[PDB]
């Protein structure tokens, strides 16, 4: 797998109500799966536009380790929520966002509640899923490749499907495969 040090410094925890998951902090934006704004009932047929208008910046609790970051804006880009915070990450690496395809390998930094747990090499199967228990409970973890000094982020985990495999999006919030973020 690729060394994970440059990506470890970007992982944060995002909490909205009773849901907590991982987010990616680059410059002064935190990226995370938009279903963080859903309750359990909401996930069956969520109306994300209506849910978002009722959320204020203070409903999002973002923690980088022991430090709380203040959210000063929020917007949706396809299936990813973008939280503007009032502090740029001083550990932001050189990066770009890329969309990949099945069979292309990448490394995933699996985190629990914003804390790095392991780094693993994987690839999506031809049906755009990942099989592998290293993503269990790791919603919002990201996948990346490293090219010299530049991190290419290519994947964000959004959900575990009923069959025990994992689905996710690119960092523009577009799903890989024919999946939607609802149960």
UniProtKB/Swiss-Prot annotation:
Catalyzed reactions: TSAVLQ-|-SGFRK-NH2 and SGVTFQ-|-GKFKK the two peptides corresponding to the two self-cleavage sites of the SARS 3C-like proteinase are the two most reactive peptide substrates. The enzyme exhibits a strong preference for substrates containing Gln at P1 position and Leu at P2 position
Domain of life per record: Viruses
Impact after mutating residue 183 to A: Does not affect ability to cleave and inactivate human TRMT1
Per UniProt, location of the Glycyl lysine isopeptide (Lys-Gly) (interchain with G-Cter in ubiquitin) cross-link in this chain: 84
Consequence of substituting residue 43 to A: Does not affect ability to cleave and inactivate human TRMT1
List of catalytic residues: 35 (for 3cl-pro activity), 139 (nucleophile)
Activity control note: Inhibited by pyridone-containing alpha-ketoamides compounds 13a and 13b. In turn, alpha-ketoamide 13b (tert-butyl (1-((S)-1-(((S)-4-(benzylamino)-3,4-dioxo-1-((S)-2-oxopyrrolidin-3-yl)butan-2-yl)amino)-3-cyclopropyl-1-oxopropan-2-yl)-2-oxo-1,2-dihydropyridin-3-yl)carbamate) inhibits SARS-CoV-2 replication in human lung cells. Inhibited ex vivo by michael acceptor inhibitor N3. Inhibited ex vivo by compound 11a and 11b.
Cellular localisation: Host cytoplasm; Host Golgi apparatus; Host nucleus
Subunit structure: 3CL-PRO exists as monomer and homodimer. Only the homodimer shows catalytic activity. Interacts with host FBXO22; this interaction promotes the proteasomal degradation of nsp5.
Chain's role: Cleaves the C-terminus of replicase polyprotein at 11 sites. Recognizes substrates containing the core sequence [ILMVF]-Q-|-[SGACN]. Cleaves and inactivates human TRMT1, preventing tRNA guanine(26)-dimethylation of tRNAs. May cleave human NLRP1 in lung epithelial cells, thereby activating the NLRP1 inflammasome pathway. May cleave human GSDMD, triggering alternative GSDME-mediated epithelial cell death upon activation of the NLRP1 inflammasome, which may enhance the release interleukins 1B, 6, 16 and 18. Also able to bind an ADP-ribose-1''-phosphate (ADRP).
Name of this chain's protein: 3C-like proteinase nsp5
Organism this protein belongs to: Severe acute respiratory syndrome coronavirus 2 (2019-nCoV)
């Amino acid at each position: 797998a690729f060394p994970s040090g440059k990506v470890e410094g970007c992982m944060v925890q995002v909490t909205c109500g009773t849901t907590t998951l991982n987010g990616l902090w680059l410059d002064d934006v935190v990226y995370c799966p938009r279903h963080v704004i859903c309750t359990s009932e909401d996930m069956l047929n969520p109306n994300y536009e209506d849910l978002l208008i009722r959320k204020s910046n203070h409903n999002f609790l973002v923690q980088a380790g022991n430090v709380q970051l203040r959210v000063i804006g929020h917007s949706m880009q396809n299936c990813v929520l973008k939280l503007k915070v009032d502090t740029a990450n001083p550990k932001t690496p050189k990066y770009k966002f890329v969309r990949i395809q099945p069979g292309q390998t990448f490394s995933v930094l699996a985190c629990y509640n914003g804390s790095p747990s392991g780094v693993y090499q994987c690839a999506m199967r031809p049906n755009f899923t990942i099989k592998g228990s290293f993503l269990n409970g790791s919603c919002g973890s990201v996948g990346f490749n490293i090219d010299y000094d530049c991190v290419s982020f290519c994947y964000m985990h959004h959900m575990e499907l009923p069959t025990g495999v994992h689905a996710g999006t690119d960092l523009e919030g577009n799903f890989y495969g024919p999946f939607v973020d609802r149960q």
